Design a protein around this nucleic acid. Structure first.
Lengths: 69, 136, 132
RNA sequence: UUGGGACCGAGUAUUGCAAUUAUUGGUCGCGCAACGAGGAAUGUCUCGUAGGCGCAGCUCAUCAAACUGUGCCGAUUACGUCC
RNA sequence: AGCACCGUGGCGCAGUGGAAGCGCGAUGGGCUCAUAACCCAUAGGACGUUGGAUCGAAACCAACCGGUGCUACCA
């Protein structure tokens, strides 16, 4: 019943989805950055990167939801 | 025979430029000072720097920069007139351009007058505008 | 220590109005001449009042004024003056090196700016900057 | 570099009831602060025009790199097409 | 436990001796009524580490280290 930060999204350009809360989330369950990112991006089979101000980018497009979970 | 190459006039090296005033600019020193060459006891223009300590001797020039109140006495021509810690001064340096300046700075810094506040932050201290230029 | 023009405190005090405005910069001179007819009627009095009354070993009682368009003469040196930036009377004591100035110069009228991260609209290119 | 000046200190006079966060002139020092023909891209022009250059009016105690108007010096190319 | 291959910019990699590059990126501009699409300018390299061969290499040889695959299964 632990508490995990609720990932929160943005729809930019109606293609990309930026995930602001990425950095905070990865910290919480105590795993690093690149490795976590890999798994996500592999499943969805898209590109995009991280870098930046540690907000993720993905080329996957969805109707905005909490269904990233 | 022998030409100049890296002369001195302050124990500071000075190019052998082939017109005389333009060499002295290095000493700070600028054109509308120098033209006192009349009173400096080498009246020369159109004459090389290389001819120094011959019979157009060097310390002639040098002395007239040190004390210009016996080779003629006008102000409106001097770096610092009516000092605000002594009564009056002439002042033609280096070396004291980076000392006298710095002391004025320090004075304002202390008692915290507006000019001195603005200059500690490195912001413009005159009229001036910011937010479009200068940008570093 | 302090030298205004190579003058300690006692010489400065000794000078009459004529001998004074001769000695000072161009602004100060220009000011005094143009004025005449008082033009600091209260701001002299209030100081010299509380100045006198002191038993020394401490500064005079502070006086407050809005005005800042008035010079600093060697008369008013040692006093504690208020100067008003539009919401706060500000504390200044008057040193011997504040002679040849005005009051307002010592009293700041803005907070200096120090920034706090630029928001959206700064950077033309768009990212919709999280979170500030 | 004697090309360019940006910044910066001191002195002085005028404008105004009030010039401090320098208002405007006017001379000394600071020039060793930039900048050596400028990427992707982009602006409007066909003859007294383009471009270069200066003056006045405007605002108005004071201050014009702006705007409005007038004059001087004065070209290159095209006078075609629908991409 | 051996064998094989690999180690180069944030990430994936090119480069058989005259020896710092490319694709994705990050950051800032430009194209567009906006977004994709698409151009341009910036910063970002102990070429795994050590020794050796060589006039001279990141490239060849050896030693060690790390990563991955294959075979090993340890009284």
């Amino acid at each position: 019943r632990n508490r995990l930060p609720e990932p929160k999204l943005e729809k930019i350009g109606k293609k990309k989805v930026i995930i602001t809360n990425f950095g905070r989330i990865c910290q919480a369950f105590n795993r690093p950055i690149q490795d976590v990112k890999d798994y996500i991006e592999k499943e969805l089979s898209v590109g995009g990167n991280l870098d930046s101000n540690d907000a993720l980018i993905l080329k996957y497009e969805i109707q905005k939801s909490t269904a990233f979970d | 025979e022998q030409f100049q190459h890296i002369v001195r006039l302050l124990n500071t090296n000075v190019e052998g430029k082939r017109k005389v005033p333009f060499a002295l600019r290095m000493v700070k020193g600028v054109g509308i000072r120098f033209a006192y060459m009349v009173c400096k006891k080498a009246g020369i223009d159109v004459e090389r720097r290389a001819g120094t300590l011959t019979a157009e001797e060097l310390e002639r020039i040098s002395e007239v920069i040190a004390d210009p109140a016996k080779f003629k006495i006008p102000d409106w021509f001097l770096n610092r007139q009516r000092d605000p810690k002594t009564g009056k001064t002439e002042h033609l340096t280096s070396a004291m351009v980076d000392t006298r300046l710095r002391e004025d700075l320090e004075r304002l810094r202390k008692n915290r007058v507006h000019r001195g506040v603005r200059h500690a932050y490195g912001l413009r201290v005159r009229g001036q505008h910011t937010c479009t230029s200068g940008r570093h | 220590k302090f030298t205004y023009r190579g003058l300690e405190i006692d010489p400065l005090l000794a000078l009459s109005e004529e001998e004074f405005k001769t000695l000072v910069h161009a602004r100060a001179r220009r000011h005094m001449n143009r004025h005449a007819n008082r033009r600091a009627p209260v701001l002299l009095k209030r100081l010299r009042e509380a100045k006198k009354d002191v038993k020394a070993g401490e500064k005079p009682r502070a006086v407050k004024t809005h005005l800042r368009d008035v010079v600093i003469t060697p008369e008013m040196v040692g006093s504690v003056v208020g100067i008003y930036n539009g919401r706060q009377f500000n504390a200044v004591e008057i040193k011997g090196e504040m002679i040849g100035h005005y009051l307002g110069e010592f009293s700041m009228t803005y907070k200096p700016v120090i920034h706090g991260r630029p928001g959206v609209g700064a950077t033309h290119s768009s990212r919709f900057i999280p979170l500030k």
